[PDB]
Design a protein around this ligand. Sequence first.
Ligand code: ADP
Ligand code: ADP
Lengths: 406, 409
Amino acid sequence: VVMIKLRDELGTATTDSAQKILLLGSGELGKEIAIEAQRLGVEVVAVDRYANAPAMQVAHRSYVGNMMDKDFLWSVVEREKPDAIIPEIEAINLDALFEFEKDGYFVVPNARATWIAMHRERLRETLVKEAKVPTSRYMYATTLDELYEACEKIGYPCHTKAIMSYFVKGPEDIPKAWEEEKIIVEEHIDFDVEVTELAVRHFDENGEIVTTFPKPVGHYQIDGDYHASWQPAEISEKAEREVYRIAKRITDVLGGLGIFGVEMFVKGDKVWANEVSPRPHDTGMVTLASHPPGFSEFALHLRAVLGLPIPGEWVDGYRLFPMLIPAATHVIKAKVSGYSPRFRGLVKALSVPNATVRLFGKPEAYVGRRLGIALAWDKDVEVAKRKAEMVAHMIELRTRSSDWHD
Amino acid sequence: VVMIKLRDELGTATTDSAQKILLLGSGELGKEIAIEAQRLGVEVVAVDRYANAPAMQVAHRSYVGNMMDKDFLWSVVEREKPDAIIPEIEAINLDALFEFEKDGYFVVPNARATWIAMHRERLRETLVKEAKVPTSRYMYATTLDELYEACEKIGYPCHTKAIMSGSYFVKGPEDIPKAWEEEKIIVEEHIDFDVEVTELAVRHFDENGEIVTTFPKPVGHYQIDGDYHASWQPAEISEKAEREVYRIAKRITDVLGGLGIFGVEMFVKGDKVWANEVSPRPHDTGMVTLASHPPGFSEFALHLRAVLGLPIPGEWVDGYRLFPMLIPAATHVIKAKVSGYSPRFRGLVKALSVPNATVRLFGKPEAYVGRRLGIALAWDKDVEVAKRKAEMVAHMIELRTRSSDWHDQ
Ligand SMILES: Nc1ncnc2c1ncn2[C@@H]1O[C@H](COP(=O)(O)OP(=O)(O)O)[C@@H](O)[C@H]1O
Ligand SMILES: Nc1ncnc2c1ncn2[C@@H]1O[C@H](COP(=O)(O)OP(=O)(O)O)[C@@H](O)[C@H]1O
């Protein structure tokens, strides 16, 4: 069960009455968690493998070290004795997380959830066997011959993914997929849209854990990287209810406190569970504009894990979290590498009404690195989507030793 | 004149391409400017007279010292060479601000504005002689003899105010000696107004590189003993009064000049509007914009964008460039009734269960009686519902310090 209880009080950061969170992973999602913590006077310690990471800049103190090293993490935890340990990435020493928890430290949402989400087979079997939710048809392959059999049985086109990816359209792609050993082979779902349901487990006034559901977030990606997201996804009411049902079955199995990014595919009224991250997810950055102040996915996660309540509205057996206005995001990604990134095109980009940008503060860029986002809002979610894309495309980037790129 | 120009580029904090702001005063208003700066990858250095002030906690670096000491401030400015020096309070060495500007550092909105606004006579004369806007009738007194004649000439009840940094509500001649005790004084006629409003006019560059002024909806509020207690947007005033508020604010900010947001204070009675005073920087009543304006557009973000030379989108209406509100909202302060270190707040299960509201706790390490430690924020389609809700949420919170018992409000 959950180690903490419903919270009625907060002290003040930098004094002996402070509450304290420890962010393991200091990227842009951790930065927004740190800003909400600062806005509540909660002390923030940010940890990552490099210095001046986004969340470290906003945090009260930081630690830099190899987050796969259990002894480094224990040293930080023993020094800081945080009220919540918030892992922001899967590349963290898993044994360490279980040991913190066994020793009484609150690991968010629990250590087991991160461990499960770490392994594709473990995760898929949990969804099928424990949560009992619908997923793409699939089979596993341990050898090249098994891969041929799987793709043929599943049917082309199919997706192959290492359990820890390739899109095989025909047998000619089998050799490539095998080179990308265990692999999961999945049937291709020709969905209308992919959605992330940001279900949050948190205490109600009785001290029991309730699950609250924001509107589904639609998104699209260039395989591996989300490129744009928006809220609400334009899906039917039946699909929406089914999205909540499936998310609830999954978060009931994972347990603990915190927000989850439950990923699903939607086609008409049909919904398939794809996977789930037991923490805030990048597509949810849209909630920085679509949810009211103090209620983005980062503030919801923070409130949940400190044991604070979160208001919601019960609708047909589901406790929903009302959206403020439709919104959308579009990533600003580096096409070059190097130190001291710079961004231009702001006169045009920042003159667009109902939109703005957030630049993450990363000190170095690498090709494909997300450096910021454009955010836009409108009564019409499609107008917000086009607008965020437009603003992001007006921005060009350069580093110390590179030329400008669009 | 403004020494920077329209900005099309931003670098990254902590690296050599960084832009950098220097906050002189690190209270709750500076903390929110620091948060928007961090959100844009802008480097923040926060200064104040005590350590771990609200903005210092969010800033990249901080300096602690007597901000009335010109040498201290120069040492910081020479070390940091910021793109903008942002005074958050009036109690800053004024000669220092003029010297920074003379040496090519950008003081917001300009040094003269802070020097004018901190002196009731320089300010009032600026409003009457240069901006040419309506104000309460007034007279100045430098002696008790002049004070008696002034109060008699203005008529009772009248307001007496010390020219710098001690006011009194004179109901009759018998109060005159008490007022002299609180030396220059301004004596004003009493204005019977319906509500006081803060117009958050912001001067900034437009896409063409010229300076324009944009107007958010007026913010209503109520001042209890020199301290605001609650504010809300939009103020419930007539459309005629609203346009007069914009007209008066424009005349005032065109005279003060520079770049940045201004908190122009006015009294409203029906369609009639009187200019009261003006703060040349973000103002506490404007915290309502943390909820009533869209993300990245509270008064703090409007100020930051303006002083970095970035554009701010607006909507032209009847000759005025307006800034659209997202949803009506209100705030109510959370003030300490006791003093001491390590404040703590309780009542959160009930207070944070109220829908469409939340709280911001400033992080101040010590409380003193009357110190503002946080605010409740609430929004609703109906501004009166938001006003009542912010008040209810604030009243659900009790506070204590390391060496005090729990106290309501
Ligand atoms: N079975 C599938 N059918 C259709 N599209 C899929 C399928 N599996 C993955 N994808 C697509 O590949 C990307 C998601 O990959 P996924 O395995 O869910 O995440 P990761 O690869 O980041 O673990 C998205 O474009 C998703 O739509
Ligand atoms: N001339 C006036 N008529 C009526 N009320 C006034 C007048 N001047 C001040 N007040 C009241 O006193 C409050 C404080 O005003 P003022 O002294 O000018 O600002 P500060 O509180 O910054 O000195 C005003 O907000 C208003 O409530």
